[PDB]
């Protein structure tokens, strides 16, 4: 996260850390959607151009964390994965279309002041809140600049209209993506960056006070560049696939 700040304790209790077993390192963010299911970006698990291809046994998830690196004894929960589910039409070759994956924990996690699931949006909530100029919030332990933090970072960013997103990049945008970020002379800055993928872009409903995950950190070109925007997987548009995997498996 570029130009963000340190998260408060328990500010993002659905934030999950995807951690590699060997070598021991942070891979990506992720989000807690139920006591057994964690959502992330597909590219965090499968990206053949970088020779990335993880199995359920290569990974742990770390739930409840604040510190990037230190083991937060009796606060965080480290869970092994039962199974990973990558969208069958995840398009890693072209533009990361449908950059989405589900991870089923072996055992359910107990909720706490530090661990609590985020809501997934329905049609009513997405129509209402996912509008250009409204702001959401992104969180992660990824880089502080294009190349980092001691603790989880947060930044709030405005949703950008589809035309501007489309014009800001030569990558082909799809309806399974949105972009967010300040325009070049808008008065503020900020962005997700490498290492923040799979983290949630959330919005607070002013009608029922709940947080909804509208996006997944998916991709950008550099970080916090003028005239460029962060791209996010559009969770609502992929919600049928989410529901099918959870209902089946």
């Amino acid at each position: 996260i570029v130009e963000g700040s340190d998260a408060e304790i328990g500010m993002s209790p659905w934030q999950v850390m995807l951690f590699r077993k060997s070598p021991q390192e942070l891979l990506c963010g992720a989000s807690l959607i139920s006591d057994r299911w964690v959502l992330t970006a597909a590219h965090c698990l499968l990206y053949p151009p970088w020779d990335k291809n993880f199995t359920e046994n290569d990974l742990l998830v770390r739930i409840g964390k604040h510190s990037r690196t230190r083991y937060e004894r009796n606060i965080e929960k480290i869970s092994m994965l039962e199974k990973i589910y990558i969208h069958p039409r995840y398009n890693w070759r072209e533009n990361l279309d449908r950059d989405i994956a589900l991870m089923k924990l072996k055992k359910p996690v107990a909720f706490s002041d530090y661990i609590h699931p985020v809501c997934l949006p329905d049609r009513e909530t997405a129509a209402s809140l996912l509008q250009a100029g409204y702001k959401g919030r992104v969180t992660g332990w990824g880089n502080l600049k294009e190349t980092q933090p001691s603790v989880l970072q947060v930044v709030n960013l405005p949703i950008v209209e589809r035309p501007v997103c489309k014009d800001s990049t030569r990558i082909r945008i799809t309806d399974n993506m949105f972009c967010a970020g300040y325009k070049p002379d808008e008065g503020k800055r900020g962005d997700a960056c490498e290492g923040d993928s799979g983290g949630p872009f959330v919005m607070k409903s002013p009608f029922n006070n709940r947080w909804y995950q509208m996006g997944i950190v998916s991709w950008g070109e550099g970080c916090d560049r003028d005239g460029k925007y962060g791209f996010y997987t559009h969770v609502f548009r992929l919600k049928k696939w989410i529901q099918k995997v959870i209902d089946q498996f």
Binding site: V118, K135, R137, W211
Partner: peptide, 28 residues
């Protein structure tokens, strides 16, 4: 069920330090 409500914030009627920015984007 009680998704999206934070024990240390919503549940305690406490605001985090920047959430007001979010709510303002909806109404100025």
């Amino acid at each position: 069920a009680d998704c999206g409500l934070r024990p240390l914030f919503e549940k305690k009627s406490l605001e985090d330090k920047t959430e007001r920015e979010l709510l303002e984007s909806y109404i100025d």
